[PDB]
C-alpha cells in the first residue's frame, strides 16, 4: 500500500474449540545476503573430505528459507500441557502463512526501493531439506528475533566429484513475488490426510491380553522325557492356563527390532574403550555407512533400568547454551521410549530365539538369538513419540514403494508436506551494495483433536510442573533474559487398553 | 449361511459379589515370565467365539443377533421372583477384550448340554507381582447395564465389519512349479521351529521343551512363539514331525489338564499350505556371507528367520471346527497383515463382549445403623436361555 | 496399477539433508577420555555438515537378501565350481529353488562396474540406478549389536546378511 502504513499485525495465541485447536505464532526475522548473491558448488573437498562415509557434493544458494517444523514453534508449554493431558490424538489440518512489515537496510539506513523475493515450491521440484531436523526454526519464545537459515542442497556424489546424473538447481528459474516495504505475502496450505499421532500409553502389554481366570483349550508340550536315565523320551501335554502364561497361544506378536548397543549413564559400568562409532548399529548405502539413528521405534530400556539407553536409538536434545562438540552428559537431554515397551521390543535386547537345527536321537536342540527381525504377519507396534522440541512432519520420499511411511524421528509422514518457503534479498549493484532485510512472520495451524472416552476408574498420570521452590521458573526467562526449556516433554500420559 | 444356536446356562455368584486384586503372588509368585497383575470381577461373560458353537458336524461372517431370555433366579433351592440379573455389552470396546485368547467356556457344540458361564477377569501393567502408576482399574458397575427380572429379555444385533474371505481351498500348484528358473514371487516369511517326532525313539533323550523352544521377548519376559507365523507343519512324506510350538493342539473329550499322552490330544497339521509357505522346521533358504575372490571361496549361511520381502505370498492358518472365529486387532499405530495367528478373522471392532452378573441381594441387616458395606448376602444363582444367530456369506 | 518409474534419483537416501546447517540433535561422540585405566566418559556432539554419517534420518534403505558377487574378470574369481554351491536360494517343501532375480537391489557399488550378483540380475543388465534408495546386492545390509557391553566385555557387532521390511523403508523396484 504505502511506506507509512503497516502491512500486517501481530497475531500470537491459541484457540481451543471443541475437537480442534488453532495455533497462531508471530516472530521477527532478519535476512542477510548469503554467498555474496552467488550460487557456489560445495563438496567435502572444500572442507578436505576426510572420510568416504562423509563424502558429499552439492550447492549453496543465496536464498534463505523459513522453518516452522518444530512443535515449540506453534505451542506454548502451557498449551502443550493442555494438549497432552486431555487428548488421545492430534494431527495437523490447515496451514496459514503470512509475511509482512518488510524493512530493507543498507550499511544503517532505510532503502525504500529495494525488494525482497519470496516464493514457495508447491509442486515439490526442489530438494526438500525441511525433514532433516536442522536448526533454524522459529524461536520457541515469541520475544526472540531469529536469523533465517541459508538454503543449500546435495546431489549425487562420487567422492567429492559429481556424476553425469547429478542435478543443479537455479532458484532464480522460479517465478516469485517481489516485495517492497509496503507489500505483504501469504498463502494457505491444506495438510494431506495423516493418521492421528498416538498421544497415549497402553495400560496392557501384548503378552498379558488374556483372561487371567480361565484356561485355554489349547495344549503345549510339557515334557520331552520321563526322568533321569536312558531312553526316557516321552510326549506329555499340559494345557495352557493362568499359572503358566508364557506358553499360551497368542494371536499377535511384538513388532520389528534392530538391536542397539546399550550405554550406561553411570559411566563406570561402561567398557573402557572407544565403541561409539565401532560398536554402532548402522546401514550401508552404495558403500557409505550411515549410523542407524534413531532407527526403528523400540523401548529404550527394560522396566527398572533407567540408566541404560540405546546408543543411537534415542533422540537427544541440548540444554540452553550447550556447546557444539563433546559436551558433558549433564548438558544434554536424553529422551526415552519407555511407554512403548508394552508392544515394542527393547532396543538393546534380542527379539527372541529360533531353532537352529533338527534335533534327533543323536543331536541336542539348538537355538540362536534373533538380533534383527523384520516385519512378520501378526506384528503390532507403536511409532516413536513426538516431543515439544521435536519435528512435526517429514516428506515421504518419492519411490516405487515404502512400508509404514511414518518418519523415524517422529511425526507425520507426508507425500506432499508443507512446501518450502524461499526468500532472498534482491541484489542492488560483482560489486553490490551491502544490504539486509527484516520483518515479521505469522504462521497459523489448525489441529484436530481426539478426546478420550476412557472408563478407567483410578486417576491417570498427567504432566505437571514441580510444586517446590526454585531460583528460576521452568520454561521462563532468567535474570539475564535467556529463555530456556528445562526438559523434553513427550506426548504420552493418558492410557488406552491394548 | 445363517446359523442359530440356543443353549441353557447357569450363572453363579463369583467372588462373593466382589472385585479382587490378583497377581502371581496371590497364586504363589511363580517366575518372571509368568508374572502378572490384574483383577477378578464378580461379572460373567458369554463366549461363542468357537465354530462348533454355530455349526454342527470361502466364507466369512456378516451379521450377528443375540438374545438372552427365560431368566430364572434361584436362591439356595427356591425361586426368587423379585431378583434382577444385570447385563450389558461393551460396544465402545472400553473394557479389556479377553475373547481373543482362546479360553475355555464356549457354548458347547452339542445343543442339549447346559454350561456354566465363565468369570470375567483381566490383566494390566506389572513390574512383578506389583503394579505401576500406569496400571488401570475398571469397575464394570460404572457401565450402564439393563436389569432383568424373570419376565424380561435382552437382545441386540451386531454387524461384522468388512473382512476378507477365509480361504478354504487347497492349491493344486506350488510356488516353484508355476529349479534355477526366474520366478516373479517367493514364499512367505519364516521363523523356525524345532522339529519333534511323534515316534519317541527318534527324539533326543533330554528335556528341551522350554529350553529348545522358539520365543519372543517383551520387557524382559519371554513368551513362547505359539502357534507363530503360519507355515507348513512338515515336509511331504514325513507325517510324524510337527513343530514344537508351531501348531494348534486340541484335547480329546475327557482329556486331563496336566501331562497327558499324545493319544489324548489332536495335533493339527498345516500341510495343505506347503505350496506357498515354507516348512516350519526347515530354514527359509541360504544367503552368501562373504565376497569370493582368488583367495576366498564362496560362503553361505542358513536363514533361520526371514521377514517380509517384496514379492512374497503366503496362506494364512486354516480354521477348524473347534477353532476360534474372530479376534480383536490391538489398537496400535501400526500392524501388518492383522489376521490373527491362531486362525480366524481379525477385526478392529469384533463382536462386543457381553457382561452379566447377578444383582446381590443382602441378608437381614442389623437394626442399628453401621457404616460398613454389607458383607452378608443371600446365596443366589440364575439360569436362562441364550440364542445367537450369525449370517455367513460364502464364497 | 501404479505407473512404472522410468526416472532415476538425483539424490541418495543418506544425503537428503541441508549441507549448510547443523541439526538440533546430539549423538554419542566419545566414550573414553583416553590413554589410561578407568578413562570412561559420555561426550556428545552436534551432528552436522562435517560428520554426515551420524545424523538422524527419517527413512532407511529397503530390504536385502545377499547375492554372491561375481566378477566379469575371470581371474578375480575363486578357482572352484560355485554356480550352484554358492548360490542364494529359498526352500519350498524340501525343494531348493535359486533366488532369481530376487529382491530388487543395486548391482554393484559406484565405480566398480565389473561385478554382478550371481543370480541377482536378468541375463547382463545392471540395476545401478536404484543404488540411491536400495542396498547393494552383494553387500551386507549393515551391522547390529550382538551383546551387552560392560566394564568386562567389549561391544560386539555382526553383519546383517538378510533384512526384511522395516517401518520407514523406501525402495525402488526392478527396471523393465
Amino acid at each position, epitope marked *: 500500500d504505502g511506506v507509512g502504513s503497516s502491512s500486517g499485525n501481530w497475531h500470537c495465541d491459541s484457540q481451543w474449540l471443541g475437537d480442534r485447536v488453532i495455533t497462531t505464532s508471530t516472530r521477527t526475522w532478519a535476512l542477510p545476503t548469503y554467498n555474496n548473491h552467488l550460487y557456489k558448488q560445495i563438496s567435502n573437498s572444500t572442507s578436505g573430505g576426510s572420510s568416504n562415509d562423509n563424502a558429499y557434493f552439492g550447492y549453496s544458494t543465496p536464498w534463505g528459507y523459513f522453518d516452522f517444523n518444530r512443535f515449540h514453534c506453534h505451542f506454548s508449554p502451557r498449551d502443550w500441557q493442555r494438549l497432552i493431558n486431555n487428548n488421545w490424538g492430534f494431527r495437523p489440518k490447515r496451514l496459514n502463512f503470512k509475511l509482512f512489515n518488510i524493512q530493507v537496510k543498507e550499511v544503517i539506513a532505510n532503502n525504500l526501493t529495494s525488494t525482497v523475493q519470496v516464493f514457495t515450491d508447491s509442486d515439490y521440484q526442489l530438494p526438500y531439506v525441511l525433514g532433516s531436523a536442522h536448526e533454524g526454526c522459529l524461536p520457541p519464545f515469541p520475544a526472540d528475533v531469529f536469523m533465517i537459515p541459508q538454503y543449500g542442497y546435495l546431489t549425487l556424489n562420487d567422492g567429492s566429484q559429481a556424476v553425469g546424473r547429478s542435478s543443479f538447481y537455479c532458484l532464480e528459474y522460479f517465478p516469485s513475488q517481489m516485495l517492497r516495504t509496503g507489500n505483504n505475502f501469504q498463502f494457505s496450505y491444506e495438510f494431506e490426510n495423516v493418521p492421528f499421532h498416538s498421544s497415549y500409553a497402553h495400560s496392557q502389554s501384548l503378552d498379558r491380553l488374556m483372561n487371567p481366570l480361565i484356561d485355554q483349550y489349547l495344549y503345549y508340550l510339557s515334557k520331552t522325557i520321563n526322568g533321569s536315565g536312558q531312553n526316557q523320551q516321552t510326549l506329555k501335554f499340559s494345557v495352557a492356563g493362568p499359572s503358566n502364561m508364557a506358553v499360551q497361544g497368542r494371536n499377535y506378536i511384538p513388532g520389528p527390532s534392530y538391536r542397539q548397543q546399550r550405554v550406561s*549413564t*553411570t*559411566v563406570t559400568q561402561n567398557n573402557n574403550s572407544e565403541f561409539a562409532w565401532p560398536g554402532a548399529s548402522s546401514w550401508a548405502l552404495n558403500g557409505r555407512n550411515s549410523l542407524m539413528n534413531p532407527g526403528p521405534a523400540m523401548a529404550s530400556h527394560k522396566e527398572g533400568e533407567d540408566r541404560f539407553f540405546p546408543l543411537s536409538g534415542s533422540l537427544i536434545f541440548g540444554k540452553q547454551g550447550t556447546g557444539r562438540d563433546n559436551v558433558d552428559a*549433564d548438558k544434554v*537431554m*536424553i529422551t*526415552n521410549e519407555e511407554e512403548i515397551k508394552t508392544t515394542n521390543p527393547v532396543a538393546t535386547e534380542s527379539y527372541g530365539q529360533v531353532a537352529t537345527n533338527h534335533q534327533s536321537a543323536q543331536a541336542q536342540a539348538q537355538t540362536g538369538w534373533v538380533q534383527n527381525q523384520g516385519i512378520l504377519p501378526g506384528m503390532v507396534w507403536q511409532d516413536r513419540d513426538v516431543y515439544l522440541q521435536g519435528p512435526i512432519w517429514a516428506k515421504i520420499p518419492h519411490t516405487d514403494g515404502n512400508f509404514h511411511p511414518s518418519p523415524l524421528m517422529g511425526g507425520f509422514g507426508m507425500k506432499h508436506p508443507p512446501p518450502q518457503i524461499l526468500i532472498k534479498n534482491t541484489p542492488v549493484p560483482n560489486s553490490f551494495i551491502t544490504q539486509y532485510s527484516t520483518g515479521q512472520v505469522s504462521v497459523e495451524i489448525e489441529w484436530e483433536l481426539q478426546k478420550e472416552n476412557s472408563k478407567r476408574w483410578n486417576p491417570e498420570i498427567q504432566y505437571t510442573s514441580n510444586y517446590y521452590k526454585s531460583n528460576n521458573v521452568e520454561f521462563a526467562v532468567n535474570t539475564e533474559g535467556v529463555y530456556s526449556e528445562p526438559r523434553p516433554i513427550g506426548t504420552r*500420559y493418558l492410557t488406552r487398553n491394548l | 449361511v445363517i446359523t442359530t444356536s440356543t443353549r441353557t446356562w447357569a450363572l453363579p455368584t463369583y467372588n462373593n459379589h466382589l472385585y479382587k486384586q490378583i497377581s502371581n503372588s496371590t497364586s504363589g509368585g511363580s517366575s518372571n515370565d509368568n508374572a502378572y497383575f490384574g483383577y477378578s470381577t464378580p461379572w460373567g461373560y458369554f463366549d461363542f467365539n468357537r465354530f462348533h458353537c454355530h455349526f454342527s458336524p470361502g466364507f466369512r461372517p456378516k451379521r450377528l443377533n443375540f438374545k438372552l431370555f427365560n431368566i430364572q433366579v434361584k436362591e439356595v433351592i427356591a425361586n426368587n421372583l423379585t431378583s434382577t440379573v444385570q447385563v450389558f455389552t461393551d460396544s465402545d470396546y472400553q473394557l479389556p477384550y479377553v475373547l481373543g485368547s482362546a479360553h475355555e467356556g464356549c457354548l458347547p457344540p452339542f445343543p442339549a448340554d447346559v454350561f456354566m458361564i465363565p468369570q470375567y477377569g483381566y490383566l494390566t501393567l506389572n513390574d512383578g507381582s506389583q503394579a505401576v502408576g500406569r496400571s488401570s482399574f475398571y469397575c464394570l458397575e460404572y457401565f450402564p447395564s439393563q436389569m432383568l427380572r424373570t419376565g424380561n429379555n435382552f437382545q441386540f444385533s451386531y454387524e461384522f465389519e468388512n473382512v476378507p474371505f477365509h480361504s478354504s481351498y487347497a492349491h493344486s500348484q506350488s510356488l516353484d512349479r508355476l529349479a534355477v528358473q526366474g520366478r516373479n514371487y517367493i514364499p512367505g516369511p519364516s521363523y523356525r521351529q524345532q522339529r519333534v517326532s511323534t515316534t519317541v525313539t527318534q527324539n533326543n533323550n533330554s528335556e528341551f521343551a522350554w529350553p529348545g523352544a522358539s520365543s519372543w521377548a517383551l520387557n524382559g519376559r519371554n513368551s513362547l512363539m505359539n502357534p507363530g507365523p503360519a507355515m507348513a507343519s512338515h515336509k511331504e512324506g514325513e507325517d510324524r514331525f510337527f513343530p514344537l510350538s508351531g501348531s494348534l493342539i486340541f484335547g480329546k473329550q475327557g482329556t486331563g489338564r496336566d501331562n497327558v499322552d499324545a493319544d489324548k490330544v489332536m495335533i493339527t497339521n498345516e500341510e495343505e499350505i506347503k505350496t506357498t509357505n515354507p516348512v516350519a522346521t526347515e530354514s527359509y533358504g541360504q544367503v552368501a556371507t562373504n565376497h569370493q575372490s582368488a583367495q576366498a571361496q564362496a560362503q553361505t549361511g542358513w536363514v533361520q528367520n526371514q521377514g517380509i520381502l517384496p514379492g512374497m505370498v503366503w496362506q494364512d492358518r486354516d480354521v477348524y471346527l473347534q477353532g476360534p472365529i474372530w479376534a480383536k486387532i490391538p489398537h496400535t499405530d501400526g500392524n501388518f497383515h492383522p489376521s490373527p495367528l491362531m486362525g480366524g478373522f481379525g477385526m478392529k471392532h469384533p463382536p462386543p463382549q457381553i457382561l452379566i452378573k447377578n444383582t446381590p441381594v443382602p441378608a437381614d441387616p442389623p437394626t442399628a445403623f453401621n457404616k460398613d458395606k454389607l458383607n452378608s448376602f443371600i446365596t443366589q444363582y440364575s439360569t436362562g436361555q441364550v440364542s445367537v444367530e450369525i449370517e455367513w456369506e460364502l464364497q | 496399477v501404479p505407473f512404472h518409474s522410468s526416472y532415476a534419483h538425483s539424490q541418495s537416501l543418506d544425503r537428503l539433508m541441508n549441507p549448510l546447517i547443523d541439526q538440533y540433535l546430539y549423538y554419542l561422540s566419545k566414550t573414553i*577420555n583416553g590413554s589410561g585405566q578407568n*578413562q570412561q566418559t559420555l561426550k556428545f556432539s552436534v551432528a552436522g555438515p562435517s560428520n554426515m554419517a551420524v545424523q538422524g534420518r527419517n527413512y532407511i534403505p529397503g530390504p536385502s537378501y545377499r547375492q554372491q558377487r561375481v566378477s566379469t574378470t575371470v581371474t578375480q574369481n575363486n578357482n572352484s565350481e560355485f554356480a550352484w554351491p554358492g548360490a542364494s536360494s529359498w526352500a519350498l517343501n524340501g525343494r531348493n529353488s535359486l533366488m532369481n532375480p530376487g529382491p530388487a537391489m543395486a548391482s554393484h557399488k559406484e565405480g566398480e562396474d565389473r561385478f554382478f550378483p550371481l543370480s541377482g540380475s536378468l541375463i547382463i543388465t545392471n540395476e545401478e540406478e536404484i543404488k540411491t534408495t536400495n542396498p547393494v546386492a552383494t553387500e551386507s545390509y549393515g551391522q547390529v549389536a550382538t551383546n551387552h557391553q560392560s566394564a568386562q566385555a567389549q561391544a560386539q557387532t555382526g553383519w546383517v546378511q538378510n533384512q526384511g521390511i522395516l517401518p520407514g523403508m523406501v525402495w525402488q523396484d526392478r527396471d523393465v
Partner: antibody
Amino acid sequence: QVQVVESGAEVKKPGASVKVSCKASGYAFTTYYMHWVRQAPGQGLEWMGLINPSGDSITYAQRFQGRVTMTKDTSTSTVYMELSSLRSEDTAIYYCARDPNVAFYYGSGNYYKDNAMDVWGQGTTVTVSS
Amino acid sequence: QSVLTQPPSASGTPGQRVTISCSGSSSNIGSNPVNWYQQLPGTAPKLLIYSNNQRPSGVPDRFSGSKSGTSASLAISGLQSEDEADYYCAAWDDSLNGVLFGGGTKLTVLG
C-alpha cells in the same frame, strides 16, 4: 586404581576460614560429580554442596549458602571446599565423594539425577576450638 | 518440613533377616531414587544400594533394597558380625534442592 586423597587435619579458631583440598587420580577428573559431606564426631552425615563435572554449576545446602565456596582445578585434579566464619558446631570430618551418575533421566513425572557416590575420600578432621 | 527418619538402632543374630527402614517426604523419597550407605566405625561410608534396588559391583547379594510410596527399606539377610555398622538412607530432596541423609541406624549383632 581410583583414589581420592583427602587433605590434612587442621585446627582453627572461630571466625577463621578453612579450605580442604581433595586430590583425585586414576580416572577422568572432568567426567564425575563431586560431593562434600561432613560428619560431626558423634552425629550422622550431613550433605554440604555439589560441583558438576564441568565445574561451572555448583549447588549448596541451604544451611551453608554464603559461608561455603567450592572450586575445581582441572590442572592438578583437585577439588576444594571453602568454609568460613567457623563455629564450634563446624568441627567434623569432611568427606569428598565421587558421583558416577552423569545424566538426568526424563521419565513421566519429575526428572531426576541419581546422586549415589561410590568413591569416598579418607576424610579430614577439622576442629574449631580456642 | 521434609525429613528423612530412621529408627536409631536395630538388632539381630547371625543368619536372621534384618530390615532397616526410613520415612521420607513426598518431595524426597516419593519422587527421587533412594540410595543406601553402610559405614563401619572409623571408616568412610560405602555405597550399598543405589537407584532404589540396584546393587553396585563388589556388593554382596544378601543386601536388598526396596521403595514403597514415601518409605524406603533396606533388607539384610544371612547376617554376620562384619555387617554391623551404621546405616544411612539418602535421597535427593526437591524442596531442599540438595541431598538429604537419614539420621542413621546403628545395627547391633548379638553374641
